[PDB]
Amino acid sequence: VNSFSGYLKLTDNVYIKNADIVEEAKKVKPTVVVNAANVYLKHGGGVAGALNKATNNAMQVESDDYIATNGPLKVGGSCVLSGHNLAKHCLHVVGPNVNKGEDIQLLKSAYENFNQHEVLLAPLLSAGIFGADPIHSLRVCVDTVRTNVYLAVFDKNLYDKLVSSFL
Numbered sequence: 001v002n003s004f005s006g007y008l009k010l011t012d013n014v015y016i017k018n019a020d021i022v023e024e025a026k027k028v029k030p031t032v033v034v035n036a037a038n039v040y041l042k043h044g045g046g047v048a049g050a051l052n053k054a055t056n057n058a059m060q061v062e063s064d065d066y067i068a069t070n071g072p073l074k075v076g077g078s079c080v081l082s083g084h085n086l087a088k089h090c091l092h093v094v095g096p097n098v099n100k101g102e103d104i105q106l107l108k109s110a111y112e113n114f115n116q117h118e119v120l121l122a123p124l125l126s127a128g129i130f131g132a133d134p135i136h137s138l139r140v141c142v143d144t145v146r147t148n149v150y151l152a153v154f155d156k157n158l159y160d161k162l163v164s165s166f167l
């Protein structure tokens with residue numbers, strides 16, 4: 001039993017809700033919140049911009065130190081950093097950005113990072129400003145993640161399409 005509330009069960013381990021991931025993180029304080037990161041950990045907009053804003057820019061400060069030490073992530077890769085006031089940890093995961101020409105096949109590699117964590121609160125990777133079809137992203141999530149994932153979909157209209165169209 002965990003604290004996540006109001007989710008629709010899609011499979012044994014994948015759950016979905018129409019919700020704002022920032023507000024959901026502040027309410028649940030999960031062990032892991034996933035950020036929709038880029039390789040530079042520049043959290044300017046989309047999910048990343050919103051999560052960073054909610055930390056009063058502390059996520060960005062920590063991220064800049066991480067990059068100065070380690071260099072950029074790989075597309076499809078991840079790193080674990082602090083969750084600040086939102087969660088114990090933030091798993092920064094880089095899905096391919098279609099608006100940069102990046103191979104959509106890397107979306108599966110990106111979701112594989114979730115399997116290193118027993119339970120996570122997450123967005124659909126490569127959705128929103130990353131330009132991928134959220135229906136495809138959901139299919140990859142369900143077919144790749146084996147740990148317990150609680151997916152937050154900000155847009156009410158998109159959520160209904162994902163549910164109503166889920167196979």
Ligand SMILES: Cc1c[nH]c2ncnc(C(=O)N[C@@H](CC(=O)O)c3ccccc3)c12
Nearest residue numbers: 045046047050127128129152153154155158
């Ligand atoms: C851009 C942005 C800023 N802050 C955010 N917080 C959470 N999500 C998103 C985002 O891009 N969402 C996508 C996917 C989803 O509905 O989850 C979406 C799809 C259709 C219509 C609107 C938005 C953002």
